[PDB]
C-alpha cells in the first residue's frame, strides 16, 4: 500500500503540472483567435466597400 | 494508510480528467485559428484583386 500510494501521488502531481501548462497554452490560443477574428471582420468591411463601389461603377 | 490510498487515487483521477479536457479544447481552438489564418491570407489576395478591378473600372 505504501509503495503504491507513493507512486500514485507522484503521477498525479505530474498530471497537475501538465494541466497547468495546458491552461497557459489555451490562453495563448484564445488571444490569437481574438486577433484573427478582428482581422477577418475588418476584412469583411473592406469587401463590403469594394462591392459597393463596384456596383456603382 | 488505505484511506490515504483512496484519496490519492481519487485526486489522481480528477487531475487526469481535467488534463484530458484541456488538451481537447486546445486542439479544437488551435485548428480553428489555423483555418481562419488561411482565410485571412485568402482575403488578402481578394482585396488585392479588388483593388486591381476597381482601378480598371
DSSP state of B1: -
Sole residue written with cell 486577433: A35
C-alpha closest to that of A56 among B57, B48, B36: B57
Chain B residues whose beta carbon lies within 8 Å of the beta carbon of residue A4: 5
CA distance A16 to A4: 18
The verdict on a CB contact (< 8 Å) between A8 and B4 is no
Elucidation technique: cryo-EM
CA B41 vs CA A9, B9, B20, B36, B46: distances in Å: 48, 49, 32, 9, 9
DSSP string, chain A: -HHHHHHHHHHHHHHHHHHHHHHHHHHHHHHHHHHHHHHHHHHHHHHHHHHHHHHH-
- How deeply is B12 buried, as exposed, middle or buried, from its count of CB atoms within 10 A (0-12, 13-18, 19+)? buried
The verdict on a CB contact (< 8 Å) between A39 and B40 is yes
CA distance A18 to A24: 10
Amino acid at each position: 500500500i505504501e509503495s503504491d500510494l507513493e507512486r500514485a501521488e507522484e503521477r498525479a502531481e505530474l498530471s497537475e503540472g501538465k494541466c497547468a501548462e495546458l491552461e497557459e497554452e489555451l490562453k495563448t490560443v484564445t488571444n490569437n483567435l481574438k486577433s484573427l477574428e478582428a482581422q477577418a471582420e475588418k476584412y469583411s468591411q473592406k469587401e463590403d466597400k469594394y462591392e459597393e463601389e463596384i456596383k456603382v461603377l
